[PDB]
Amino acid sequence: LLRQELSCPLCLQLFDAPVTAECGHSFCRACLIRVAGEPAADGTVACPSCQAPTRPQALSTNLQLSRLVEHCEEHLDPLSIYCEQDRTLVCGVCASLGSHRGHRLLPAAEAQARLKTQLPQQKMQLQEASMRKEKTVAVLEHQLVEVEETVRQFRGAVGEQLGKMRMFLAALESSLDREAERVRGDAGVALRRELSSLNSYLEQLRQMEKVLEEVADKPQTEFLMKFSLVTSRLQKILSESPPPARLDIQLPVISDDFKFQVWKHMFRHLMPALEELTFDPSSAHPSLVVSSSGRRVECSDQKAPPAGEDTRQFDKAVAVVAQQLLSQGEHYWEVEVGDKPRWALGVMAADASRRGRLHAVPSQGLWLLGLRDGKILEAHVEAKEPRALRTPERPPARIGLYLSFADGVLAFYDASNPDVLTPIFSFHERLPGPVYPIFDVCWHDKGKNAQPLLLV
């Protein structure tokens, strides 16, 4: 093992006084010194091999292998043959004795000729190992940068999740403390108006008391003069007898009901940017009259003219789609429905045969929903039969809708109060998209389906 366990990959010197580390390794001194990079100034001097460090300040000087050691230094006979059964080089005397008296072999000259011939193949394996190690280096850089930049995206989402409600709270507190401060200004004006009034009154009253104290002993003429003057002024200020009442504030004060309604108002007012970039009539229909930037809809008393047959347009399906749709991000918009007693909403891809709303259900991804007669829901869902819902204790007025993607986050909830929305139903599952959601209003229907339909 002079060349098997006593083979330093760095030195192959005359091994004596090996340095032992807490990793469980024995090695040489300058051989290990040849490794550069990490001095104790930058930190640990860990073993690059076995995940167990050892500082140069924890010397456990153990020379066990150096004392286990004992041309050739044993026979003056140079190393002679590499064993072909043991796969080991020894010297002729040291080989025949001990190790290699009983194996199969190949002669030394032939073996070294084989090696001197095969040299470039091992060099190619060397540069191939270098190529693989650099492939792994590139994987390392790509993985580390992808991780830290995904962290960049996550911390940015954190930043925006902060910013939404942070700016909301700042704006609400500022608005309402300025409201309170303007009430302060009004009350201050009132109190200083009464201040000026009553301050003039009492100041001149005490002036009057001192003046009468002086005038109590004047001759009869000016005596009566001042008497008449004071009589007139006192009768005037008693005619100006103001019957005063208190103020009776009705300022909305911080109770402990606010939390619910204010928290709904923020739950609504969480809203990213504008979606006032309108629709596409690419499959529009006859029976409707539109206005208000082409947005408010109804029907009128003019029979509707038919349309020539076209491939994309429906046979009769009187519905509407829009223009924009993405496959990333978030979007919001707001509508109202008025007194409309029957309508329908759903969504469809490029796959269905648009001409004909015959038997066609979300079984093929032809997603449906509708309602008749005020509140009578008809939920055609992944079952050929509709379902119903609540009859709420108040009529529904507006609608508001929002889209997020990764979960197929579809959102459409009533907004009968612009301060606060009220949920109706959702389906927490994913849709690939973007295909279009489509929305339908029925015909004139004798004028019964002819009452206005709002939007902004």
Add this chain to the structure above:
Amino acid sequence: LLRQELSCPLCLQLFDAPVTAECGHSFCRACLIRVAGEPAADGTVACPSCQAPTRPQALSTNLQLSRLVEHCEEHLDPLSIYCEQDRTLVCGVCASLGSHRGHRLLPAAEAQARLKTQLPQQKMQLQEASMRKEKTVAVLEHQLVEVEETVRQFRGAVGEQLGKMRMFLAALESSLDREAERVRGDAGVALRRELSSLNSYLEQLRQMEKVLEEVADKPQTEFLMKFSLVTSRLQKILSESPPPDIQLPVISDDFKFQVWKHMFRHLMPALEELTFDPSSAHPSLVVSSSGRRVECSDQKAPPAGEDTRQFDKAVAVVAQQLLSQGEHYWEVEVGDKPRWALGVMAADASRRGRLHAVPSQGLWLLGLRDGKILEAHVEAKEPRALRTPERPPARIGLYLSFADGVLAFYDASNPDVLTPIFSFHERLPGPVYPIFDVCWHDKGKNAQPLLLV
């Protein structure tokens, strides 16, 4: 026909030079120039009775008798006769001429004798006016203190309303970014260990290349030495052939909802480490663990006593303490309990007599029997129920605020978050007591141990 401008009715002093201004009033200047309170030292422009735009240099004056005279002295006849149709006292010439040739009057003496008699009565009226002025000053101070203390309460509610979610967001971001930093540390440990490995590999590869470059032209002995050494080490490293992914739960797209869910939990109102009260305790509800955890067994119970603070038949529990301001939150578990009851009552109803005691007298009820048959009653014939959700119910949450009667108790099928399924709506003067009851064993299975906090 007011003669009020004999002098200024608000100054009663020397030369005035009356101002005819756009306020609709006749003004002086020294009246409030010598005296502060409505001063020009800060830019005041208001009338103490109208508050109209007016400046002190719009003079349109009269100096008739001021230039004439230097006692009436318009005739060298002092004021002589008081007039009664107009309540004026003038001199014979100035009265009879013009003003007072045709009125009711008092010539000489009775009126001024009345005045000399009534002097102290008008002084007493002056004391009354002083008392009224002090009433108005006290109203001023009361308004000042109410205003500044309303500012106190509003700014304090603002501070705490900030602090709750401000500390919540800070804590959540800190916890999760430190979690991210620890994931960074893990990735750093992996990359630096592989760094040490591969840098040692390439460094000793460079050593091998330089050694072979130097030594490729040496004698055969050390040649064969190197041959065997490299053979052994290279077959060792080919045996050491490495045969080579974070699953971090990322934010969802509905993620905003769950973040709001956890905030809805950790809103952090006051803590209620104050459990039930055995002020009317009974046998079959054994309590332990600082009066928290309760059980019961198959040994019959001593019969009922009779006193003030004890129930009719209900072997049940009442509460110790309750105030009239603030908020109180808690989270509960029910185990496999299929039947129980909770409610609230005032100091008026009797705890004796198990007849149909109902919220008809404001004795508000809620209960459950037989697995999931909910029974929540108000003044009617039968208690009501609701949809029975599918995912198994585990835990409960409850909340109280006082001034608005904010009563709350909602499902918490995951203790992280509650979901509103059933509660009532009333404001109570209070504080009236919450009471709690568990029914019998029914072979043991109707009575299983109970917990809170």
